[PDB]
Design a protein around this ligand. Sequence first.
Ligand code: HEM
Ligand SMILES: COc1ccc(C(=O)O)cc1
Ligand SMILES: [Cl-]
Length: 399
Amino acid sequence: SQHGAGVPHLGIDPFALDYFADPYPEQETLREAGPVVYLDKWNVYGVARYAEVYAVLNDPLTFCSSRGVGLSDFKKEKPWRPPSLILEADPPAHTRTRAVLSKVLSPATMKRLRDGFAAAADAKIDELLARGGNIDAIADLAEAYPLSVFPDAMGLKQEGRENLLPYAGLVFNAFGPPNELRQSAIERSAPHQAYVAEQCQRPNLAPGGFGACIHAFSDTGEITPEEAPLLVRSLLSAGLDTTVNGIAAAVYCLARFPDEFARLRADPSLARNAFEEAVRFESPVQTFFRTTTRDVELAGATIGEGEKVLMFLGSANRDPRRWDDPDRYDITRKTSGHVGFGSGVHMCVGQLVARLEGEVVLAALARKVAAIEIAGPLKRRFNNTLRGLESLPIQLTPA
Ligand code: HEM
Ligand SMILES: COc1ccc(C(=O)O)cc1
Ligand SMILES: [Cl-]
């Protein structure tokens, strides 16, 4: 390896705590430096503009996922857990396991489940207003709401559910480099991993839920009985804390930007796009990696075989080369093509679940709430892959 000959090198640590606290100046530096940069801190290439993020995402055989989508290269180091059969696979293996999850989380499934999700969101906003409206948008809403619907939709038992958010925090930290956040999460992981490992098994998943639906594909031969609990493991990894942070992004956006909330109230049919624009704007899933499978030319750079490439999805989603006024939260923006859910063959399989949760929460706010205001100090949460808040006191004014 030439280790980044011919491209600009930068010392920016995109996994440093001061960076997660305020990433936007360094994301701009990463974009301005060039289309391809080399990050000295971790000896990986980086792409922070929309054009190259999009190109890498849409070339999955060249920029592969089967050597891990975190920093660690699975060819060189044993993975911290056995690889995801969907996220950390390439076609054709990826095609067959993705197709199972695309059927489980299908658009018709979302329509059959819609009233359950919407009634829970209505009831939650009612509860928050009956409390007086002075509530923590994180604990009381962004966290509480997905906890009230997703474990039941999975068919998980009641007991042990406190393990779910720590498990997700661990998975998202573990894509990161071997820093304190990662080391510490892995050290405390055993009980969370054990809980998950157990709940993925068929006898532990209630009939009618997503878990049992996956396991049914083993009965028809479409997957094996040892694949089935791993595909359940994917949904327990990615299905809860992503939506918590996307809901948090949406509430935080609407709270800061009252004119946009008033627009949402005027036309509640903007709920879906308001949620999608929050996903662009905050990019709750900030980064993933790929690994080159061959020597490649990317935007003028040479990249050797077997190099990690860090994609900055959150910077791509704010890149002024692609987005008009990228730092504005605009709930009528044409958001199509943002990379907050990825792009191409691995584009979020659960996006219909995430959008259903976000829509129903925003629709309940649009109908029941006259105004939203930040009410007290916020506290940001640091995670190697996720962006979002630990606390956000708000005031909801009832309609
Ligand atoms: C706002 C919430 C969400 C965000 C921002 C998000 C983000 C992402 C991103 C960026 C990817 C691309 C991964 C890559 O390209 O390597 C992805 C894929 C994936 N997501 Fe989501 N996600 C969300 C919600 C969910 C939910 C609710 C589920 C499950 C119910 C889920 C399950 C998955 C799985 C299994 C994949 C792997 C798909 C594949 O590799 O083909 N996600 N997501
Ligand atoms: C979007 O984040 C993830 C995280 C884990 C997995 C998985 O475990 O398959 C998928 C997506
Ligand atoms: Cl695990």
